[PDB]
Ligand SMILES: *[C@](O)(C(=O)NCc1ccccc1)[C@H](C[C@@H]1CCNC1=O)NC(=O)[C@@H]1[C@H]2CCC[C@H]2CN1C(=O)c1cc2c(OC)cccc2[nH]1
């Protein structure tokens with residue numbers, strides 16, 4: 001037993017990290033088969049970042065302007081293209097450590113592991129949730145751009161995040177591996193604010209199921225609710241509305257405990273309306289919102305990769 | 306900026322994990338060069354575990370009683386020996402993925418990364434502190450024994466922990482890689498209590514510095530304290546004593562923030578005496594003690 005935020009084992013991703021340099025600017029890239037993926041702002045000087053025209057900046061670059069390195073070992077660039085905010089560099093060597101992989105675009109509330117890297121060298125791994133305002137509460141210093149976020153299922157690495165930016169509030173923003181930002185952000189040196197954040201309801205419900213599984217069930221009430229009435233009251237407390245997909249991903253936890261999803265919603269509603277009244281759940285006075293239903297199952301059951 | 310509990314990248318350790326079976330027991334082993342290290346209780350029946358005379362049980366085993374599997378490849382055992390609570394199985398194949406490594410025994414309050422494994426396959430990675438009472442607050446299920454804890458410095462893996470047991474309270478206990486338990490625990494099938502846990506004061510102070518570096522100062526005050534007066538209050542709240550060595554180790558964080566160590570001690574004293582009053586620090590409603598000064602420096606230097 002025990003409940004911990006847990007990262008996926010990072011080895012399959014470590015074997016894909018490289019560095020990409022254009023001029024004096026070095027950041028991280030992801031080497032899969034014979035392509036390296038990295039943030040397109042590698043082509044910019046610090047002064048270019050104030051108001052970059054990427055298309056015009058990239059026309060001035062050739063294959064021979066890109067230095068891609070696996071450690072000290074140079075991989076020759078043989079082609080380049082831009083896809084949204086990511087640069088794809090074709091290299092002359094297929095990565096022998098390429099895992100089975102997919103590129104996925106995640107939803108708010110989904111969690112992933114971040115492999116923080118500097119100069120192509122992995123430094124640490126931690127777990128993040130995509131917030132409803134499309135930021136993550138990460139830990140990233142100068143040099144971290146191009147670090148990736150991912151999930152593992154069986155043998156397949158699903159890459160979902162590439163790091164680009166730190167907002168003035170100290171939270172982080174980036175793209176999927178097709179280079180589309182999560183949220184309304186742009187890769188320009190401007191002050192950019194995220195929307196007001198909300199609490200990830202589906203994950204709170206997962207954590208209440210985790211509590212029940214562990215015999216901590218004082219908060220289970222005798223009511224139910226409709227999904228619509230729940231969503232309307234939830235929004236008053238700065239909680240996200242539930243989607244049908246949220247209801248579906250809570251299905252296994254509902255089956256395990258015998259507590260209907262909408263009955264758990266009614267329990268959560270009472271917690272929001274009345275508070276905890278000096279009580280705790282899983283040892284905490286705060287409702288946790290960065291464990292998904294999958295995070296609860298996979299950690300309670302011990303799935304490997 | 307930002308501050309997150311962060312593990313070392315686990316790839317160098319993943320390449321060393323194998324499965325070890327003896328009789329009805331399967332657990333994990335650590336394959337370095339031509340030796341597999343695992344918990345000695347792999348040899349025991351359920352009946353043996355009430356009072357296992359390990360030397361007497363092990364002399365009854367042959368090399369062929371140990372089945373070692375690395376992925377879908379069996380590794381033939383060609384010798385075996387026991388060092389305290391660790392069994393060493395010599396195999397006929399060198400692990401090509403053996404990293405540069407050391408075996409170290411960590412001190413209470415220090416942190417390490419755990420690669421939780423089942424059936425020789427990595428499941429997840431997380432950070433733990435060795436508690437003052439020599440337990441860890443892990444996440445370990447049936448089959449996790451033989452999972453290891455480690456730190457990485459440059460290219461060198463320092464292994465410090467091998468997993469053996471879950472106490473009645475839900476905390477965890479294990480050994481170093483020489484097979485010596487951390488704490489007063491024994492590898493027998495009994496309910497075992499730890500000593501009174503205490504809070505790792507130097508780590509709480511480090512985490513308060515992390516909070517300041519990340520733009521939160523609400524808990525600071527205009528006061529100072531002496532080291533001894535701080536220690537009197539710390540001990541009253543079941544916190545470990547702060548030594549001059551701890552004060553010195555906190556020097557870089559003090560210099561970075563301009564907050565003297567004993568001024569941060571006065572802030573911590575006030576937090577202990579008044580509580581947090583419904584407020585949080587770095588998203589936590591409680592004072593966090595599993596980040597070392599090094600862990601903080603690694604994420605906060607240059608912010
Ligand atoms: C990322 O570009 C990176 O790591 N680059 C390599 C590097 C190497 C040496 C020195 C600096 C950078 C970087 C990651 C940041 C840095 C600190 N923590 C991080 O997560 N991203 C940026 O610096 C990012 C660039 C890229 C896309 C937009 C551009 C601005 N930017 C910001 O993070 C940024 C700009 C502002 C701002 O502009 C006036 C106001 C407030 C906050 C802010 N953040």
Ligand SMILES: *[C@](O)(C(=O)NCc1ccccc1)[C@H](C[C@@H]1CCNC1=O)NC(=O)[C@@H]1[C@H]2CCC[C@H]2CN1C(=O)c1cc2c(OC)cccc2[nH]1
Pocket residue numbers: 001330331332346354445446447448449450469470471472473477491492493494495496497
């Ligand atoms: C570890 O041995 C293990 O994973 N073994 C393989 C395995 C495979 C299938 C099924 C069960 C085990 C195991 C790890 C535990 C299990 C749950 N979480 C963990 O961390 N350790 C033990 O079970 C451990 C063994 C080995 C050393 C001492 C012996 C007892 N023990 C305990 O954890 C233990 C015994 C008791 C107890 O005994 C009467 C009462 C209360 C608590 C307790 N814990």
